[PDB]
Design a protein around this ligand. Structure first.
Ligand code: ANP
Ligand code: ANP
Ligand code: MYZ
Ligand code: MYZ
Ligand code: MYZ
Ligand code: MYZ
Ligand code: D12
Ligand code: D12
Ligand code: MG
Ligand code: MG
Lengths: 344, 218, 344, 218
């Protein structure tokens, strides 16, 4: 580690240059990851916001649960205690001056809404502010929702189902606009099911509940493809590139080898140096990630946890160390006389 | 007295595309403690090639080289613990200071660098007060003696010096070869020293002259 | 150019390694570009498929045209000759065994459909094969479309509007399912408008017609952000990285400078070499792009033209040449004695 | 006869962190055509520093250096057209062959490389048939003479040779300095040649001895 750490003292300019390249790539991952995780929540942010533990569906013939084909009968609702019935519909919303199709979620009156969304379920419809502005309506107006006249009870913030903002209505209203005697589409369990379900019922955890959203499956393919190519290419770009960088030391490694440096000494020196520079690069790249990302998450959907900033960061940190290992190995492999020859 | 180094019937052959070049041909060299053996010969006669296998920088293409008291060790560990190299070119590491050029050999040999040992050896080769210099701030001959001082930093039993006075004026080159033989005598070293300055043979006990890769009769 | 081209002869291994890094980055761009251009056509592929030149909307008060609020009256249709009325609705499709919300487009009977889609407009509904399988229906069955019973006339391939596959129906049917006397939502012009529109009409070219789709504007933000960060980061990663690469020649450039090489000679040599290696890297990176991309465009939406494969390719080719220019300049800037000093 | 090169009252001062080092102090050198001036002095006395400004590798920190018949030219164009360098270290480009080490100077000087000129100059420095060698397949002295041959490849009026025989045996080093003076005489060259082999002064018309950066009285 003796030579390794002073190579940095002696040309901080070129080590800043190299840390930039690592930070730039870490930054590319963290924003592209958070930008596509944002696109994913265009289908799922509403149900996650409600934070259910398990969620009961309804099927026939043991099929896959589908949000478009599940209904909770009123007797079904009285059975499962500690449960809240949720209605999910997509329907036409129509004001005097404009219209749209939007997602309508229905809960029993007085249900506290997730803090991601305004306040409490009231009688009538709670519109996202952006949908209210689009329709040019305020609290008090009338709209047509699913062919039915509904009163705008107030505005709230936006959560999403199947790429539309969600309008929040009381179960009786949701029944009216979706034309059904059912009290909901699923039942939200906030603790964990203590009772077992029948042959046509199916309990699912929140992860699998998205498998039941059609807009989700038919695009989850496209998002995984992006996150796949991004990491695969990044990995190879990073590995290949730490090799090209470490190779610029072949000659001083060759000289140390000639004097008697063991390959362990040389590899420790090499990744000791690489560990320091890569640490800086990913730390700042992930730093500028969170700040830039938090800064932009008001105008563009940008979801990003902490396994998605530090997950990539250490991913690059070790991928870079193997790239450095590749280089040091291809020099120490050879008798030192040849390594001293490949240098001028 | 057993030899420190035995080069028994050694050769080096390089490929020259279609043909091949025989850099060294059937070398037989054996050196005992306290000996300083000079090596003379024209440019390209095989002098550095002989030291390259003497120093385990490469294995010979035919024949064997044995450092005894280090049999049962790989080439790398042999160089680290028993051999000191004065390369033909200075071969200084770009980012270290003259002082650290010596210190790093302590580091690779797994002991805490001895800071005072280094400035003494630097002073002996006529470089007192230059320990802080970087390679760019050193002259061709100053670099060469940093190279030299680095070879004496350990406790080898075999010293291989490759034209260590090429870049030195008459007065300093003589002090360097007095330095080299003195340590040879004091520590019972086996030293081979290539030189083009044949006046320096006076400080050598024997010498090997070479032409076209072969040792000649002496 | 003398030294430059034989540096390649003398270490083809390290030049393959460097071309890989360029190709890997070009490949990253070409697939991520084509994967997001695919996500864009989830809203737009249907209307593009119909290939209109201009498209007439209807507004009130000179507003922005909206697909959700435009209607073409039957008199409006007889006015503009050479025009075809297109109805666009989102509604609930319901079979015996399942349901969904989907886009329904309406054209006059017998209208040839774009070859991207099956055959001709027939009376009834033409379902995409995937929607038909989802609903478990075939040609001949009945479905409920917008509360109305409609006969499945046959299946076709999939084009998209607002993230749903498009069901194709005759104008009379589209009128029935969308509950309107209007004959369409817009009028498609395949040549170019020769007549002028009124105060509440608005003519738009196909580009602007997407501004009228709500699902498009509210996500066009997220896709531009991705294509922005990808190119910005890529540019900087490429520039910074050709500098680190060219810098490995500082010393031989220093020696040529000392002997008398003009800076023009040195820069020509440097980008001559760089031009060759970058050309290889982007050519293969864009090559593996089109093949890998064409190979995957059956399971994942992947749209990609030729300005989106060769647009990026030359983008990297010149960005890399400036990176090489940066390096050669920072060596030739200095008196050659100092450059020979910074080398050992 | 006007001088080819005038070093009029020149100095080089480097910063040594807090302090400063005066590598060269008030050099006054003037050389006329057909002169071969040797430069003697101990390792670190300023010999290469004097050639570095003589060769426009750096501008002096005080005083001026003028190559006449090249006034009105920048440093770079002056080196290219009028100066030939034999660097202390061989300074060979890593990917070229010995033959191409010469040819590339033709390339940078904007004329079609003369393939036959190069193998003649390579033969003159005793390297016939080695034109295809890469730097790795050359010995320390063989590299040095490729360095030497490269300096004679152009048509300079100023030749700067920096210890060009350091890596040469007694017999070859003498032929190199006969080679250097012969071209000096035949082409009316101004040549300065640093050497530690003071026997070689016999081939020099004058010599400058130096100590601590200053020229001494001779
Ligand atoms: N960049 C530098 N910075 C500080 N000191 C320097 C620098 N370059 C050279 N020196 C010192 O300048 C003095 C003479 O330099 P130099 O001209 O290279 O020696 P020389 O006469 O050529 N002798 P030698 O090369 O050993 O045959 C030496 O003492 C150097 O330590
Ligand atoms: N890798 C190589 N491939 C082909 N030929 C080589 C190679 N290395 C050395 N040679 C030749 O081997 C011969 C002697 O090599 P070498 O031992 O380096 O010379 P030397 O005795 O040290 N003389 P010098 O370095 O000039 O003082 C030379 O003719 C070289 O051209
Ligand atoms: C976009 C990156 C631009 C980089 C600009 C200059 C890089 C100079 C590198 C300094 C090398 C010397 C090390 C100190
Ligand atoms: C991670 C942020 C990277 C921003 C892009 C380029 C910065 C390059 C800085 C190079 C500094 C070289 C200093 C000499
Ligand atoms: C993922 C990239 C792995 C690269 C593996 C080995 C690189 C070796 C580079 C060869 C350098 C010698 C040039 C011939
Ligand atoms: C563009 C395809 C890149 C695939 C990933 C790595 C390939 C690296 C090949 C290095 C070859 C080095 C040869 C020595
Ligand atoms: C005495 C030599 C010690 C060298 C210490 C410099 C290391 C600085 C590394 C900082 C990297 C962010
Ligand atoms: C005689 C030297 C000519 C060297 C020609 C090798 C250039 C090959 C470049 C191929 C890059 C794809
Ligand atoms: Mg040698
Ligand atoms: Mg010198």
């Amino acid at each position: 580690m003796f030579l390794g750490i002073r190579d940095i003292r002696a040309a901080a300019g070129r080590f800043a240059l190299i840390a930039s390249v690592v930070g730039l790539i870490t930054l590319l991952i963290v924003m592209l990851t958070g930008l596509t995780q944002g696109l994913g929540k265009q289908n799922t942010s509403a149900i996650e916001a409600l934070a259910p533990h398990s969620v009961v569906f309804t099927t026939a013939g043991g099929s896959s649960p589908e949000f478009t084909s599940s209904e909770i009968s009123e007797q079904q609702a009285e059975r499962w205690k500690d449960s809240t019935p949720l209605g999910v519909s997509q329907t036409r919303i129509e004001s005097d001056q404009n219209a749209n199709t939007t997602a309508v979620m229905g809960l029993p009156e007085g249900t506290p809404l997730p803090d991601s969304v305004g306040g409490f379920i009231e009688q009538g419809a709670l519109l996202p502010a952006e949908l209210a502005d689009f329709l040019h309506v305020r609290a008090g107006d009338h709209i047509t929702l699913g062919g039915a006249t509904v009163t705008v009870a107030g505005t709230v913030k936006t959560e999403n189902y199947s790429h539309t903002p969600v309008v929040w209505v009381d179960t009786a209203t949701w029944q009216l606009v979706s034309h059904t005697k059912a009290v909901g589409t699923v039942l939200l369990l906030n603790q964990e099911p203590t009772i077992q379900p029948q042959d046509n019922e199916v309990v699912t955890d929140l992860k699998g509940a998205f498998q039941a959203m059609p807009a989700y499956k038919s695009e989850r393919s496209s998002l995984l493809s992006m996150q796949a190519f991004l990491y695969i290419i990044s990995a190879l770009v990073t590995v290949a590139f730490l090799t090209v960088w470490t190779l610029q030391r072949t000659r001083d490694i060759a000289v140390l080898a000639a004097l008697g440096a063991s390959k362990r000494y040389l590899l420790i020196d090499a990744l000791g140096q690489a560990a320091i520079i890569l640490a800086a690069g990913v730390a700042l790249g992930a730093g500028i990630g969170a700040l830039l990302g938090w800064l932009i998450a008001g105008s563009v959907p940008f979801s990003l946890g902490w396994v998605s900033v530090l997950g990539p960061a250490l991913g690059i940190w070790l991928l870079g160390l193997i790239g450095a290992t590749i280089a040091v190995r291809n020099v120490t492999k050879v008798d030192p006389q040849i390594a001293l020859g490949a240098t001028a | 007295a057993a030899p420190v180094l035995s080069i028994t019937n050694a050769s080096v052959v390089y490929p020259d595309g279609i043909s091949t070049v025989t850099a060294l041909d059937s070398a037989n060299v054996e050196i005992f403690p306290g000996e300083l053996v000079a090596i003379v010969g024209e440019s390209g006669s095989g002098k550095s090639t002989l030291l390259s296998i003497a120093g385990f920088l490469q294995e010979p293409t035919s024949g064997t080289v044995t450092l005894h008291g280090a049999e049962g060790l790989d080439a790398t560990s042999t160089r680290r613990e028993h051999i000191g190299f004065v390369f033909q070119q200075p071969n200084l590491l770009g980012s270290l200071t003259a002082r650290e050029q010596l210190l790093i050999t302590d580091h690779l040999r797994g002991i805490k660098p001895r800071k005072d040992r280094a400035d003494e050896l630097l002073a002996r080769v006529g470089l007192k007060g230059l320990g802080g210099r970087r390679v760019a701030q050193l002259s061709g001959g100053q670099r060469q003696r940093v190279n030299i001082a680095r070879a004496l930093m350990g406790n080898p039993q075999l010293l291989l010096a490759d034209e260590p006075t090429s870049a030195l004026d008459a007065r300093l080159s003589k002090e360097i070869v007095e330095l080299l033989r003195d340590v040879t005598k004091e520590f019972a070293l086996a030293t081979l020293m290539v030189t083009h300055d044949r006046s320096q043979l006076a400080y050598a006990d024997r010498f090997v002259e070479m032409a076209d890769g072969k040792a000649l009769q002496t």
